[PDB]
Amino acid sequence: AVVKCKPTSPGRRHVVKVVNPELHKGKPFAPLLEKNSKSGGRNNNGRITTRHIGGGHKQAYRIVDFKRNKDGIPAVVERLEYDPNRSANIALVLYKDGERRYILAPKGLKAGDQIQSGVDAAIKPGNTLPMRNIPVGSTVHNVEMKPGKGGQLARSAGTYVQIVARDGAYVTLRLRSGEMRKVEADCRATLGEVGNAEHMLRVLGKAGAARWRGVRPTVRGTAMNPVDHPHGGGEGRNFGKHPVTPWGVQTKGKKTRSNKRTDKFIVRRRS
């Protein structure tokens, strides 16, 4: 929408909530749900391996077809609904012979829309094709980085990607983060923009409302002693040293990329 809240206890009157009345408030499609038990930021034998993650509420995971299995099959968008595993909302797609899958949502909110992959398939956004058949400047929706590997990038509310060059067998993406890189033109693009787009207008309201969103507190490293977190210093309120990670390394401005596999496909990177 988005809309303001009203106060029941001091204070909430200026808080904002997203509200999307065009999404179906009913039940998720059951053959696609898994238990997906929480791990509390603790690995197999640990001890914490990611901090601040902890608590529920209990939530099932919905299996999405990001890999887009099978090709050229006619379908229809039967339902648009919200998904709490993610933020861009979901689409329930029904293939002509009764096969149902969860798929990443369009910008659209109108249901019953008929969609198919192909190049003799209607030119509209939501009909997926290989990037060898499209012009420069196009917004591509969510894409695969290797042919048949499935959808990565621009999956968050209202996010997209643009193709800014093409030559021979390869196409160049421009990322909204400030990155510019190549992928193979055999890779599939769905065209346009992803659903929701309003999520960044929300402002939660009260500290407790994060505790059912998988959040727990942890005390400031600068407020404890250096045996515990390395950012701790005697008497506090005047550190005299650079700010650091829980392992005594820089926490402002220090770059950490060391992949060395995917980098020769890149033209420009994030500042």
Add this chain to the structure above:
Amino acid sequence: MKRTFQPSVLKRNRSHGFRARMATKNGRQVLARRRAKGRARLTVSK
């Protein structure tokens, strides 16, 4: 008030219980030192 001992056999027989002690490196060694001490029982769970 509350005691540190709170009785339950499900928990005490997976805790100090013989079957995993007889299936773990150092638990097997408790049993070998107890055969050498000559105890009437090797278990402590009954």
Add this chain to the structure above:
RNA sequence: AAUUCCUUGUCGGGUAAGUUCCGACCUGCACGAAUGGCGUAAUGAUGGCCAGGCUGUCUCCACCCGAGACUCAGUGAAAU
């Protein structure tokens, strides 16, 4: 002043007297604008002060009641 040593500074408000408080003066041993600088609705089993209320806190305690104490028959420790 949650910051100023000599120093219990000064004046207005104030108290029977205030090294109290509030406001003013700048007359702050190196307060000073992202650890911000200053106000500030809401919150306070909240420090510094005032009034209004109420009192065994006090002037100063007087009596009344139980259960110990005291005394008796039995059980019967420790530091040293």
Add this chain to the structure above:
RNA sequence: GCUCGCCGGAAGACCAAGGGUUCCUGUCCAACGUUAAUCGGGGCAGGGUGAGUCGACCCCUAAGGCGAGGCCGAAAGGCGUAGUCGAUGGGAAACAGGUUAAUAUUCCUGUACUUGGUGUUACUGCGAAGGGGGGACGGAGAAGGCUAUGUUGGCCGGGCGACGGUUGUCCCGGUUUAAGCGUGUAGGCUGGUUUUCCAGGCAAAUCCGGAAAAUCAAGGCUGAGGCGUGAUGACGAGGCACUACGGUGCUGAAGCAACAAAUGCCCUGCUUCCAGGAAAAGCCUCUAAGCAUCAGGUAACAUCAAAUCGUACCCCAAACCGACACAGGUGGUCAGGUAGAGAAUACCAAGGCGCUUGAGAGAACUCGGGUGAAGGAACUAGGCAAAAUGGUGCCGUAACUUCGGGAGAAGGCACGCUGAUAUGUAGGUGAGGUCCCUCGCGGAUGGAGCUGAAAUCAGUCGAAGAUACCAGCUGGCUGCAACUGUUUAUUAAAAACACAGCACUGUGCAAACACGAAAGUGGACGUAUACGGUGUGACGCCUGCCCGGUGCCGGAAGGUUAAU
């Protein structure tokens, strides 16, 4: 025994993990037990808790653990797929009248029900460690239909009384009851049939999923009570004969209706909210294999076993834990009457207990209570401690404010009981007659029966009605942290800590990063409106100077400079 005092949402009764004969009876004197023991929970000899259904196991699964093949590590050992364990959760099936010194859904009796087997009959395609369905899940709230229970009638049985009155300005006890099966109602939810086509469900499929034309709707699904039915029974005031007595044990009357409400049922209903709230097997279907010598299925009748371990008792405790029989800990079940909003609190049932060292005395002093002259914080570093206030309905209510708040600001008024309006109003319920009948355990309409405020008015008593229990320190100036929340368990609950938010920054997904050299796993199966690291901490108004130091990012030539 009798009388007394106490608990009675417990100080009663049942229970899971807990322990395991401490149960029931006789007996003991030696040891033990806060005194003394004639007593035992301590000793000795006897008596006893029977199951397809209730518990656990047989079968299933979460978090997790273990693990052939496959991998890591001197090695022990560790991961991890097939596989297999795993309860705090899912698994077809029960009721309660008798019989005793302990127990019984188990024995006795009556009846119902589950899985498989073996027969008997009719018809017959059934079926997997595979597909589809189911299992299947959160938080809150208000209606509709009800119910155990209580309250009061009718019904059954009785009293009319000692002290003043009680054959009528009424009182005592009874009025109980089932799993299951039926009707399927109430409540709730909801479109079928026919012909027919099809790129889906790892193979296959008449199941499920996708779609058209035709036609018609008043049918379907799900399920409390009521009533039926288990029951022409059991139980039950009573009835009857007898050991001259421990009970005996056959037989039996009334056994109906309203009203108020669940902590219970329809209800794994409805509406609503946003945190969208386990899985699998048994179970229901579809098909592969297998087979017709059948096996299996549907319906009906007969009929066999159903093991394994459990079952006593203490149980919010001298049978569980506290060194001890110690003012302690303590998951679950249950909810009578008066008053009350209530599981507060005050008095009492049913039921239980009398705190297992006591007896005198009536010293201060001391713990804990009651009342208090004439003043008042004069006390104390601190109005500390104590005290006042206080209920619950209505009126009234400032500065400041971000106009939400502040606000229970401040302040004021009223309070019993009786009677009447109305021999009981208003609220709720509801029968007869009548009316309407997608037809009836129904609806509309109106008030026989029931339940029944509160207010006003007028009396009435005392100085006194919040008549007991119940139950706020308020306002003014100022500091500080925005707030609710957290913390040194055991001298600090705060101004520190946390937070929506705000800022700075890392990160392109085999992300950054963690622990491990790795094996893996978590981040995350998320994807820059996402995730990681750090600081700062509502909001409003604003926010000067500095690159010498210390770290980062970019520039990329050159310098110091390694192995080579």
Add this chain to the structure above:
RNA sequence: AGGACCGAACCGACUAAUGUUGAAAAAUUAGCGGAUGACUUGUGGCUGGGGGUGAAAGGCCAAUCAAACCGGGAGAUAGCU
């Protein structure tokens, strides 16, 4: 509708009180604070000693703690009581 009004259970541990060879190796009482919430909690599993776990106090880890408990090096070493 509520990290809303009030208030038992329950939980907290701010003030008062009793206790100190305790009834209790901090417990028991009253007031106070919270009381569908960032609340409170039963059973299991996971994490451990230079190691865990912390809305943090260098708090706590089976009565023991800024390195618990148990077994060894080891009758360690001590210009010292």
Add this chain to the structure above:
RNA sequence: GAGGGCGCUUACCACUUUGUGAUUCAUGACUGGGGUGAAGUCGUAACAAGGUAACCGUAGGGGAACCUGCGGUUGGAUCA
């Protein structure tokens, strides 16, 4: 005796006490801006192309007259 007063009493009641909130004149440590004299100090802001044309509006900035930025004007001189 009665009738009526005086007395008593129900009603209203001047006078009169408090709480809580407004209102109004004057006054208050101190302080901002206004007025003033005097060949002050510092700069020279408008009048002329007024010394960098000026003015209307407006945000920021300096010790200040004002300066800078942007929109609006040309009531303004110079080839004009």
